[PDB]
Amino acid sequence: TTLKFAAFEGGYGADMYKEVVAAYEKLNPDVKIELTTSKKIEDEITPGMKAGNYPDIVELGQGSTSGLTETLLKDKAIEDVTDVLDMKVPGENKTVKDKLVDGVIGLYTNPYGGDKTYLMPMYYSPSGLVYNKTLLEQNGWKMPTTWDEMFKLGDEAKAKGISLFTYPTAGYFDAFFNALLADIGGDQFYQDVMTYKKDVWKTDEAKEALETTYKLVTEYLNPDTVGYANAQDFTKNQQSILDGKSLFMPNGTWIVNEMKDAPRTSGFEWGFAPVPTVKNGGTRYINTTIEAVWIPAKAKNKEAAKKFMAYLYSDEAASIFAKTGAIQPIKGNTDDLASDMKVFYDAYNEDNVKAVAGSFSATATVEGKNIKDDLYNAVDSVASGKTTLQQWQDKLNETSNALNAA
Ligand SMILES: CC(=O)N[C@@H]1[C@@H](O[C@@H]2O[C@H](CO)[C@H](O)[C@H](O)[C@H]2O[C@@H]2O[C@@H](C)[C@@H](O)[C@@H](O)[C@@H]2O)[C@H](O)[C@@H](CO)O[C@@H]1O
């Protein structure tokens, strides 16, 4: 059996997929895997798909620029892999679900919101705000827990010639908004946004999420941010953190390996912290950032791909992924963490800090509309002065209500 496997090359690198594929072929001598890894995995497989040649299994989460996963989800072109949760992990005698940590099978994995899983969870990386711990301590600053403190810090930093905030690409606001929305309104309000409850963007809580972000990207943003907020130059904005020209950026644990070969200010130490909330004593949420592994409905070897998918939750697979910081969402995989990951996961141990996860529902779609463009990509426009706060809200409410109608 020959499996065609396409995987996204992100901050964790592609060598881990080469080694994992090699390790599966050593365990399972009857399976050969043709692995394709690429930073542009959409452009690789989409021509073959529209020509009839589909890969058997794809590693690509929600949130890409092309939105390939969401598109195939809209065309009902992604195989139901709920039975993968019950499969025996190759090399072991445990089921996939026996090994999964809590709070990783949800709206992201069940984009139609039922009991059917279509995107199996990949990785397990906390997202929040990444900064230089040493730079903050050198200036006598403490990590803000509220946005009032965050903007007062922005003023203090601005007086020293340091921008408060930057971001790699606008897409990185999926984790940011997941935290900020849940911080302000709570869990039910969060699910309501993700599932397009009518007029949810007209609520005071959704307006406050937009006002806070509007103030951030229009008054406390590194001036070079939007010009570099693309797939080719996103690391430039990330470098401004290592250079000390920007304090904070929304990011996840892949940043450590992704910026492994980069210069940085003397004494640089990674800092990690939840996005601040708006109210004293409010819960702060860290985003469980996962990507997805999935099988197209047109795949020709679904059964062999499912068995290989189960192997991605094995101890062997987890130890290979872990070398670059990619922590598979299996139990105990945060025990015995590498030192460079401790600052990130230790944020879960802070008082009144919990987890948030999920993405937008795929149960409805409207031609010409894209809620992820209206919420995430619209930051670039808002930061550029092309979109007012009222225009931002009106667009989100219109798109969300339209999606509600379907
Ligand atoms: C620029 C890039 O590819 N970065 C990836 C990173 O993808 C981003 O992950 C964050 C998580 O908050 C957001 O989902 C963001 O939208 C992602 O960026 C998109 O992904 C790719 C496909 C690209 O088209 C971008 O233009 C999009 O903005 C990965 O999470 C990370 C780990 O694999 O590696 C890279 O850094």
Residue 336, judged by CB atoms within 10 A of its CB (0-12, 13-18, 19+), counts as exposed
Ligand 1 mean position, distance from CA 65 (Å)? 8
Helix axes 187-194, 173-185, angle to 10 degrees: 130
Topology, domain 126-286+360-405? D-Maltodextrin-Binding Protein; domain 2 (3.40.190)
How far is Cα 230 from Cα 221, in angstroms, rounded to an integer?
A: 16
**Cα 159 to averaged position of ligand 1 atoms, centre (Å):** 32
According to DSSP, the residues that pair with 95 across neighbouring strands are 88
Cβ partners under 8 Å of residue 115, min gap 6 = 82
Identify which of 234, 242, 268, 256 has the alpha carbon closest to the alpha carbon of residue 323.
256
CA 277 to the chain's CA centroid: 19
Of the candidates 389, 200, 179, 197, the one whose C-alpha atom is nearest the C-alpha of residue 285 is 179
CA distance 398 to 318: 43
DSSP-based three-state secondary structure for 38: strand
Resolution (A): 2.7
On whether the CB atoms of residues 122 and 105 are closer than 8 A, the answer is no
For ligand 1, mutation pick of 37, 62, 65, 225 (most atoms within 8 Å of CB): 65
Residues 6+ positions from 284 with CB-CB distance below 8 Å: 145, 179, 183, 274, 275, 276, 277, 350, 352, 353, 354
DSSP 105: S
Residue whose Cα lies nearest atom 22 of ligand 1: it is 64
Contacts 24+ apart (CB under 8 A), 185-194: 185/209, 190/356, 190/358, 191/107, 191/358, 193/400, 194/107, 194/358, 194/359, 194/360, 194/361
Neighbours of 29 (CB within 10 A): 7
**Paired tokens of 338:** 């590498």
Q: How many CB atoms lie within 10 A of CB 139?
A: 13
Is beta strand 270-273 parallel, antiparallel or unpaired with respect to 120-132?
antiparallel
Report the chain's C-alpha Rg in angstroms: 21
**Residue found under tokens 């340091």:** 162
Q: Are strands 2-8 and 120-132 parallel, antiparallel or unpaired?
A: unpaired
Q: What share of the chain is helix, strand, coil (3-state, %, to 5)?
A: 45, 15, 40
Nearest CA to ligand 1 atom 28: 171
Among 221, 183, 178, residue whose Cα is nearest residue 379:
221
Q: Return the domain boundaries, the chain.
A: 2-125+287-351, 126-286+360-405
Ligand 1 pocket list (CB less than 6 A): 10-12, 63-65, 127, 168-169, 171-172, 174-175, 231, 234, 252, 254, 258, 289
Q: Do domains 2-125+287-351 and 126-286+360-405 have the same CATH topology?
A: yes
Largest alpha-carbon pair distance within the chain? Answer: 64
Cβ atoms within 10 Å of 379's Cβ, excluding its own: 28
- CA angle (105 as vertex; 99, 109 as ends), nearest 5: 125
Of 292, 297, 310, nearest to 358 by C-alpha is: 292
| b/e map 176-197, b = 16+ CB within 10 Å | bbbbbbbbbbeeebbbbbbbbb
Pairing of strands 120-132, 246-252: antiparallel
Residue entry with tokens 């025990």: 335
First to last CA, the chain: 41
In this structure, which residue's CA is closest to atom 2 in ligand 1?
231
- Count of other CB atoms within 10 angstroms of residue 32: 11
Q: Which of 37, 42, 64, 272 gets mutated to test ligand 1 (max ligand atoms within 8 A of its CB)?
A: 64
For Cα atoms 216, 404, 188, give the angle at the middle one, nearest 5 degrees: 60
Spatial CB neighbours of 293, under 8 Å, sequence gap ≥ 6: 57, 58, 59, 119, 120, 122, 309, 312
Point out the ligand 1 atom lying closest to the alpha carbon of residue 11. 34
CA separation for the pair 249, 238 (Å, rounded) = 7
If you take atom 6 of ligand 1, which residue's CA is the nearest one? Answer: 10
DSSP element (H, E) containing 394: helix 389-405
Measure 64 CA to ligand 1 centroid, in angstroms: 6
In the numeric block, which tokens belong to residue 150?
Answer: 């965050």
Helices (H) and strands (E) in the chain, counts: 17, 9
Return d(Cα 210, Cα 216) in angstroms, integer. 10
Residue 226 DSSP label? G
Task: Compute φ and ψ for 381, nearest 5 degrees.
Answer: -70, -45
DSSP code for 373 = I
**Structure-solving method:** X-ray
* Cα angle: 253, vertex 255, 261; to 5 degrees: 140
Quick one: which atom of ligand 1 is closest to the CA of 251? 12
Please compute, for residue 28, the number of CA atoms within 13 A of its CA located in the half-sphere on the CB side. 22
Cα separation, 41 vs 59, in Å, equals: 9
3-state secondary structure of 195: coil
Token pair 């309000």 is at which residue?
Answer: 189
Contact 7, 37 (CB under 8 A): yes
**Strand residue runs (E) in 228-269:** 246-252
State the burial class of residue 52 (Cβ atoms within 10 Å of its Cβ: 0-12, 13-18, 19+). exposed
| Per-residue DSSP letter, 95 | B
For domain 2-125+287-351, give its CATH number from 3.40.309.10, 2.60.15.10, 3.40.30.10, 3.40.190.10.
3.40.190.10
State the Cα–Cα distance between residues 149 and 354, nearest whole angstrom: 20
Consecutive H or E run containing 298: none
According to DSSP, the residues that pair with 131 across neighbouring strands are 271
Residues 6+ apart with CB under 8 A from 13: 257, 324
Residue 207 CA, chain-centre distance (Å), reads 23
Contact criterion met (CB below 8 Å) for 195 and 113: yes
Which ligand 1 atom is the nearest neighbour of the CA of 62?
14
Structure tokens at 302: 């679904």
DSSP string, 144-194: -SBHHHHHHHHHHHHHTT-EEE--S-GGGHHHHHHHHHHHHH-HHHHHHHH
